[PDB]
Amino acid sequence: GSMLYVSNLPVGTSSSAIHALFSAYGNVKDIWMLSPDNSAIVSYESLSSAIVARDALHNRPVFENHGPVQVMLAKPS
Amino acid sequence: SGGSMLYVSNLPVGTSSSAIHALFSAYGNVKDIWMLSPDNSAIVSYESLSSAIVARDALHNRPVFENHGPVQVMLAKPSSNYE
């Protein structure tokens, strides 16, 4: 699989909202939210999905009233 | 599925994943490590919540590396699973 760290979300963003956003690019297996819900760890089934989602969403303001979201690839070891 | 995630930030520049395992293995069985290079951050997983809490308490806001300011460790909430 692959994994992403997503930050600069609006405070209070729901895991459901993250799932909907990231499900367009792959099969989301798990989401961990970080308090106060302005960042999240997103796990995908396929290696390719994190790369495609990052290309789609990184540095874009996908939420109203808020700046661009940051999407970082989590490099496994 | 399941398990606890720590988001670790303000690592010294050039900190490797092997160094991170060494540091976090003091508090339990590290399950996985991901590096957020080129940023000085990482993600550390433990299967046990109590290991993650103890690690977070021991390391958050602690200058654990020489000649470097305090490392940050944030425990994520329990995950949602979609499988």
Q: Is A34 touching B (CB cutoff 8 A)?
A: yes
B3 touches B31 (CB < 8 A): yes
Cβ contacts of A32 on chain B, cutoff 8 Å: 5, 76-79
B27 touches B51 (CB < 8 A): yes
Report the candidate in A48, A46, A38, A45 with the shortest Cα–Cα distance to residue A70.
A38
State how far residue B69 is from chain A, nearest Cα, in angstroms: 22
Any alpha helices (H) in A1-77, and if so which ranges? 15-22, 47-57
**Cis bond before residue B38 (omega within 30° of 0):** yes
End-to-end CA distance of chain B: 8
Q: What are the two backbone dihedrals, phi and then psi, of residue A21, each rounded to the nearest 5 degrees?
A: -65, -50
Handedness of CA A47, A52, A53, A55 (dihedral sign): positive
Q: Is B7 touching A (CB cutoff 8 A)?
A: yes
Q: Residue A18: which domain range?
A: 1-77
User: Distance between alpha carbon B28 and the CA centroid of its chain, in Å?
Assistant: 12
B53 touches B75 (CB < 8 A): yes
Which residue among B34, B37, B83 places its CB closest to the CB of A3?
B34
Which residue among A31, A32, A72 places its CB closest to the CB of B36?
A72
Structure tokens at B70: 């305090």
Within a 13 Å sphere around the CA of B42, how many CA atoms are in the beta-carbon half? 23
- Name the DSSP letter for residue A60: B
How far is Cα B66 from Cα B62, in angstroms, rounded to an integer? Answer: 11
- Domain total of chain B: 1
Which residues lie closer than 8 Å to B57 by C-beta, 6 or more apart? none
Q: What are the two backbone dihedrals, phi and then psi, of residue A75, each rounded to the nearest 5 degrees?
A: -85, 120
Structure tokens at A38: 């302005």
State how far residue B68 is from chain A, nearest Cα, in angstroms: 23
**Cis bond before residue A36 (omega within 30° of 0):** yes
Handedness of CA A34, A35, A36, A37 (dihedral sign): positive
Task: Please report which helix (H) or strand (E) contains residue B55, including its range.
Answer: helix B49-59
Q: For chain B, what percentages of helix, strand and coil (3-state, to nearest 5) are there?
A: 25, 30, 45
How far is Cα B23 from Cα B44, in angstroms, rounded to an integer? Answer: 11
